Design a protein around this ligand. Sequence first.
Ligand SMILES: O=C(Nc1nc2cccc(-c3ccc(CN4CCS(=O)(=O)CC4)cc3)n2n1)C1CC1
Length: 272
Amino acid sequence: FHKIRNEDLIFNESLGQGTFTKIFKGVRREVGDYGQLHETEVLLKVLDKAHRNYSESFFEAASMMSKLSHKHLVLNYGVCVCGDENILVQEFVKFGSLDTYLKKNKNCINILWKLEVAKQLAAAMHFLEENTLIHGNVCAKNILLIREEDRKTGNPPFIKLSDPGISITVLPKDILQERIPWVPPECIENPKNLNLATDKWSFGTTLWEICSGGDKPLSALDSQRKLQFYEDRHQLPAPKAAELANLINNCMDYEPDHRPSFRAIIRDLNSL
Ligand SMILES: O=C(Nc1nc2cccc(-c3ccc(CN4CCS(=O)(=O)CC4)cc3)n2n1)C1CC1
């Protein structure tokens, strides 16, 4: 990671919190191309001091996203580890997390918009699968909207996938259960089962979110009931807009070996 000075970072408004983290919009003062000085908008992710013992995993997650370069992956700019802080410095995506956007703009998102976003997410995941690189936390809140759809110019929306955060392989069990049905059944049974097939399952859950206007599946179930949901081998209900329900259920296969490749997922999406 590139090291960024604390004095070059300005923390501004809170964007909420993640698991053991707080997130802010900020500004990074930097020398850019041609030596020009810039004050660049950045996403600042801060590991809670009380959870400093996760620092390794915290940075490993981000390092995953910098292992490769791709148009659908959020950029890491660097880290600030001055003093008692563990800070990730990332690209700031103008329109933010997709679940919030879906909840706010549900009354004007149609099947074509959803198909474009689904195809872009699948393209990103196909890139990761070809590189045998596990993401491990695919979900709508980790999809960021770079550009809105502009039908006046035919321009489709454009999204990127953000870093997965601290890995489910080290998180407490109660958090994993709260993350049902994004965390697949085999990872509830054993978080060390994290594998490429994990991201196919979570991709299914994320499509469900995209089709459900930002609703969270199984939100009315407490952790014990989410566990039993897996134990009874239930599937998610079809969204009212049911165009992707079969793909959702095919990806959310309780047999990890049977989940379709992302190449096959993309072929399916292109057939609609
Ligand atoms: O937020 C914006 N851009 C932006 N860029 C990036 C780049 C990387 C990561 C993020 C990001 C920020 C926050 C979150 C969690 N978060 C908590 C409250 S929640 O309501 O559940 C919606 C999601 C998740 C991802 N972001 N976010 C624009 C709208 C102001």
